[PDB]
């Protein structure tokens, strides 16, 4: 009737990665993108399952940001709005500081927030960033899905347009696709010796050739 802000677990007859097989007992559909895929049984322990879910979420978000920052500047260079973009050679460019001191500064700045996130995972609610306004009531967020004023300034979560489970599976699926994409780009940059969009262009033309088997 209103907006439900709780994740709804998928029914036990949900579509699976391998239809006709029995989904594992530790995957009951309560997690985003739950398709019953665990051949090695790595998620048997619920605590390790929570840690692996958070790790998958983090890898998903970093991979989506990574693939966006590879593809969009590469699509701009092919269009012509970037003079000398190359994501493989981007790390060896000349900046205002050495890579080592930039790495140390990045380590400190990122280990602040990664460690605040660690404290939130260990103790939910120990660190709160959303303001405690005098009569506004802050809803309790899920671990790994925070966000009031800063991380969720759109209020697109918490049951708004698509239910929280639907948007979370969408995020997880795009993240898995981006992880596979980034690993593919990393292998293509050292195998083909070319860019991503160039490789796509030579694969779309005569796809019977210009493949993994022709370098």
């Amino acid at each position: 009737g209103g907006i439900s802000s709780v994740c709804e677990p998928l029914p036990p007859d949900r579509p699976l990665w391998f239809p006709g097989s029995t989904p594992p007992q530790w995957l009951d559909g309560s997690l985003p993108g739950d398709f019953g895929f665990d051949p090695l049984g790595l998620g048997s322990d619920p605590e390790t399952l929570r840690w692996f879910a958070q790790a998958e979420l983090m890898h998903s978000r970093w991979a989506m940001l990574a693939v966006a920052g590879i593809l969009i500047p590469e699509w701009l260079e092919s269009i012509g709005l970037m003079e000398n973009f190359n994501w493989y050679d981007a790390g060896s460019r000349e900046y205002f500081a050495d890579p080592t001191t930039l790495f140390v500064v990045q380590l400190a700045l990122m280990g602040w927030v990664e460690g605040r996130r660690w404290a939130d995972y260990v103790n939910p609610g120990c660190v709160d960033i959303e303001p405690k306004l005098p009569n506004r009531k802050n809803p309790k967020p899920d671990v790994g899905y925070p966000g009031g004023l800063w991380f969720d300034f759109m209020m697109w979560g918490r049951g708004s347009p698509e239910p929280v489970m639907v948007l979370r599976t969408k995020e997880i699926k795009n993240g898995r696709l981006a992880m596979l994409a980034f690993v593919g780009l990393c292998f293509q940059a050292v195998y083909t010796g070319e860019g991503p969009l160039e490789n796509l262009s030579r694969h779309v033309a005569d796809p019977g050739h210009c493949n993994i088997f022709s370098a």
Binding site: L133, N135, R136
Partner: peptide
């Protein structure tokens, strides 16, 4: 007469609960 009977000099003419109230305060927007 201000419940001080002694002031009865007019002596003639010249011719609501159940609503219930709660504490409401404005708060910051979304």
């Amino acid at each position: 007469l201000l419940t001080m009977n002694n002031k009865e000099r007019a002596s003639f003419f010249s011719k609501y609960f159940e609503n219930k109230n709660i504490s409401l305060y404005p708060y910051e927007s979304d």
